[PDB]
């Protein structure tokens, strides 16, 4: 698709049995083709004993058919097709769709239509094939049982109440994936899979007269049977104020909302394109105005947003959602209703509607004159969208003319009317998400309506106007420091400067930097430093990183960095502070200047702080009672005895002030710093900038911070607390070992050979292992080989697998073949050579070199690391990956 192809020629036809089909011929690229068939049936069409059947049928039509008793998918495998790359299917509420991208394209067209016709007209749906497929369906089921789905279901339950949708999720239930017989599948198939309920689209390098004869060849003889009439895609809208809790005991969601449901495709006698355009204008105007209203929210709500979503074929929902400091949902809903009320009093800002309308007229003008041309993958995406909702495509060129014509009949009076109908909807909903164990009882509807009438009678300030945008500039630094010494390592192209304030500069003049400057400033100022308060210091770090200098703001910062192709970011780990950035050589003063300003003049954006307080408070409330919280607390007392630090209570969090956070930041920013600089430029260019921005920052000697070191010994623990049917097996093991570049590579080699053998020892599927992984590195700051093995598996198998991995480790040192190693050595050798001139690796190794040697030696003689890889040395190291004397096992089982 490298030469864009123009607006294609569309041909549509209808077979005698009702089968509908669309042929779209592109000029190119050569041979490429795309084939799609929709069956207008989804899980909404299921009856009660048909849970998940639409989706199971989706799977099952790939198995035995009349022409292919060994399976349709298997004929496709034997002709070179691949699952997910060459064919796929998707099932949602309303439709089932089958996608084909034949490996040889145009040539495989009749092979493709034979397969689709088999799938839709001739599926055997055999019980014996069902019993084999059930393994795969259960696996798709088990994979999407997390907390995101359970909440997604909560949202569908509430916003689509009084409809078929909540009780008809696509995947269905575990019981019906286990117990539903293939005869139920055949009755479903025989009710819904008929040609007048199906439509086909073919896109690409095709001859329309020929593709049509093939579609006749394989689809025309299908019997023309009718499917039932349907008029149930729509919630039953009625005047009401429904009140719903959105709840899951593992969700940190803390939010409130008020929602209006209504028929969104009713255009009231006017142009339905014009109507859809009013919607876009209205949403853009509302999105601007609701943002400004952030100023009006009490401390208990933040991030007020308006969202509009389709919740049927014709009904949409309009929602105002806001985040809630846990505990303050009543106050938050009042604020939402207050702001909704304000939008009823006052018309939308007319300069917004003028600007927005103008931006749209601009793009529609351009669209109406430039001939539409697209790449193949683009054409498919555009045509598929319009074809899934059973509508003909309209060119972007023609759509521009339609928009211009509809903008002429649209003034702000219309926008306000459009917006006021939504707000006048009589079908209304109020939803609450309250995290963890926060005291909450669901309001009754009148308690809400009371609030509505309170704000209806109240006197309300006008809508907020747009604040004018502060565009920031860094200050003038004239203050200069001075370099006080120079140690030279010419053989690594590295100089090491000492600076008058105590900092130092490790400058590496790598040609691999090109015209960019790479800055890494490290220092001993981690959030566990003795002077600091661990939780406050991490929050200070995060807010400064996001706010920028004191006189700036989060948004003006992100703006300012983008205009300069500059990045700079703060990472405060437990033992270290690291600021990381890149800039074009030109903008070297901007990067050092931005760095100096984070150090000496840090900012806290009020909005960012408020958002982050709520993010922290909802996770605290969740984690005090969530499974995730209890696993992290047990893992800590198993591995460390006590938490190194802990998040605060919500009450203390609520009192945090920007002065107290800045206080924390300055303790971190006072630690002496080493600037690892990678830049290809003469010292005479780099020295003046280093003496002005970097050497003039006040510093004070800091102590090293003690590592968080896992305790030695054998401890184990089992907890039946999981909520999904799964067992979680984690075990930890270390062996103190001195760090050398070789020892680190030997460990990673041995862990690879380890990684495949602990798979042999444990590939019996009767063990029901869902996922397992094995990790091992010679950690350089801790100087110990640290190994982690983790399983997720079914619960009954669960305690046998550690036993066998343990055994697989004892076995391993005598089982490493020679051609394991020298295939890994060849693998390392080539992977290393990918890494030379890789700036990420050069920078990582310079920093590491100074950590262990206090010089840049590790930048040289990488070529002789490969030779530390012998068989005798990888065996002697594989014997050290698991140490039975230092072992921690943690087993999480489903709650009994």
């Amino acid at each position: 698709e490298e030469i864009k192809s123009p607006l294609p020629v569309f041909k549509e036809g209808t077979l005698a049995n009702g089968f509908r089909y669309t042929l779209v011929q592109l000029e190119g690229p050569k041979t490429r083709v795309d084939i799609r068939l929709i069956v207008d049936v989804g899980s909404i069409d299921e009856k009660d004993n048909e849970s998940g059947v639409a989706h199971m049928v989706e799977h099952m039509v790939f198995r035995a058919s009349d022409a292919f008793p060994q399976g349709v998918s298997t004929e496709l495998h034997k002709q070179g097709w691949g699952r997910g790359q060459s064919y796929n299917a998707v099932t949602n509420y309303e439709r089932t769709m089958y996608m084909m991208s034949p490996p040889k394209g145009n040539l495989d067209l009749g092979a493709t239509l034979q397969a689709l016709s088999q799938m839709t007209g001739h599926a055997k749906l055999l019980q014996s094939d069902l019993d084999d497929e059930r393994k795969i369906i259960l696996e798709e089921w088990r994979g999407k049982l997390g907390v995101a789905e359970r909440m997604n279901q909560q949202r569908v339950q509430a916003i689509r109440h009084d409809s078929r949708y909540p009780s008809r999720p696509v995947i269905g239930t575990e019981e019906s994936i286990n117990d539903t017989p293939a005869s139920v599948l055949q009755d479903f198939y025989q009710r819904w899979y008929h040609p007048s309920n199906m439509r086909l689209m073919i896109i690409g390098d095709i001859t329309p007269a020929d593709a049509e004869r093939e579609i006749q060849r394989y689809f025309a003889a299908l019997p023309n049977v009718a499917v039932p009439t349907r008029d149930y895609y729509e919630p039953l809208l009625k005047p009401q104020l429904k009140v719903a809790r959105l709840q899951d005991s593992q969700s940190g969601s803390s939010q409130v909302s008020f929602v209006y449901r209504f028929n969104d495709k009713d255009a009231f006698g006017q142009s339905e394109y014009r109507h859809r355009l009013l919607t876009q204008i209205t949403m853009s105007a509302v999105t601007r105005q609701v943002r400004r209203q952030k100023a009006e929210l009490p401390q208990d709500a933040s991030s007020l947003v308006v969202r509009k979503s389709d919740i049927g074929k014709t009904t949409a929902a309009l929602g105002f959602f806001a985040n809630v400091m846990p505990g303050g949902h009543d106050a938050a809903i009042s604020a939402v209703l207050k702001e909704i009320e304000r939008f009823k009093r006052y018309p939308l800002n007319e300069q917004d509607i003028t600007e927005i309308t103008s931006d749209i007229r601009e793009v529609a003008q351009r669209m109406s004159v430039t001939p539409e041309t697209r790449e193949f993958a683009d054409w498919v995406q555009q045509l598929t969208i319009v074809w899934q909702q059973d509508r003909p495509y309209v060119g972007s060129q023609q759509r521009g003319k339609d928009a211009l014509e509809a903008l002429d009949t649209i003034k702000g009076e219309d926008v306000n009317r459009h917006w006021q109908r939504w707000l006048a909807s009589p079908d209304t909903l109020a939803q609450f998400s309250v995290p963890g164990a926060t005291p909450f009882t669901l309001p009754k509807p009148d308690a809400i309506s009371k609030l509505q009438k309170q704000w209806a009678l109240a006197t309300l300030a006008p809508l907020r106007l747009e604040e004018k945008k502060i565009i920031p500039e860094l200050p003038s630094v004239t203050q200069s420091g001075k370099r006080t010494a120079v140690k030279t390592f010419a053989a690594q192209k590295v100089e090491q400067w000492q600076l008058s304030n105590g900092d130092r500069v490790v400058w590496l003049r790598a040609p691999e930097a090109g015209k960019k400057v790479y800055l890494t400033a490290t220092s001993q100022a981690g959030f566990m430093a003795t002077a600091m308060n661990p939780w406050q210091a991490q929050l200070a770090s995060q807010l400064v990183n996001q706010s920028g200098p004191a006189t700036w703001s989060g948004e003006s910062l992100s703006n300012w960095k983008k205009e300069k192709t500059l990045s700079l970011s703060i990472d405060q780990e437990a033992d270290q502070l690291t600021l990381s950035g890149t800039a074009p050589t030109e903008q070297l003063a901007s990067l050092f200047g931005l760095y100096r300003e984070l150090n000496v003049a840090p900012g806290i954006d009020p909005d960012v702080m408020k958002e982050s307080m709520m993010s922290l408070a909802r996770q605290k409330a969740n984690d005090d009672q969530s499974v995730g919280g209890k696993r992290a607390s047990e893992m800590t007392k198993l591995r460390f005895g006590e938490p190194a630090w802990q998040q605060p209570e919500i009450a203390e969090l609520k009192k945090i002030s920007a002065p107290a956070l800045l206080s924390q930041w300055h303790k971190a920013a006072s630690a002496p710093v080493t600037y690892y600089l990678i830049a290809d430029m003469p010292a005479t260019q780099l020295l003046p900038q280093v003496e002005r921005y970097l050497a003039t920052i006040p510093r004070q000697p800091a102590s090293e911070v003690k590592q968080h070191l896992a305790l030695s010994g054998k401890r184990e623990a089992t907890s039946a607390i999981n909520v999904e049917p799964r067992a979680d097996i984690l075990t930890w093991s270390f062996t103190p070992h001195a760090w050398t570049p070789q020892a680190a590579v030997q460990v990673s080699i041995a862990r690879n050979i380890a990684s495949k053998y602990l798979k042999t020892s444990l590939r019996d599927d009767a063990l029901g292992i869902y996922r397992m992984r094995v990790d091992s590195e010679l950690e350089d700051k801790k100087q110990r080989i640290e190994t982690e093995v983790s399983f997720t598996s079914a619960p009954e198998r669960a305690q046998e697998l550690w036993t066998l991995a343990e055994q697989a480790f004892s076995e391993l040192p005598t089982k490493i073949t020679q051609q394991d190693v020298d295939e890994q050595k060849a693998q390392f050798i080539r992977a290393e050579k990918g890494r030379q001139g890789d700036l990420t690796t050069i920078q990582r190794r310079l920093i590491l070199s100074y950590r262990h040697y206090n010089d840049p030696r590790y930048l040289s003689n990488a070529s002789k690391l490969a030779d530390s890889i012998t068989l005798e040395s990888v065996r002697a190291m594989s014997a050290k990956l698991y140490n039975p004397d230092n072992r921690v096992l943690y087993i999480t089982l489903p709650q009994e």
Partner: peptide
């Protein structure tokens, strides 16, 4: 929905 892509 967006009917005319703007940015």
């Amino acid at each position: 929905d967006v009917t005319i892509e703007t940015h």
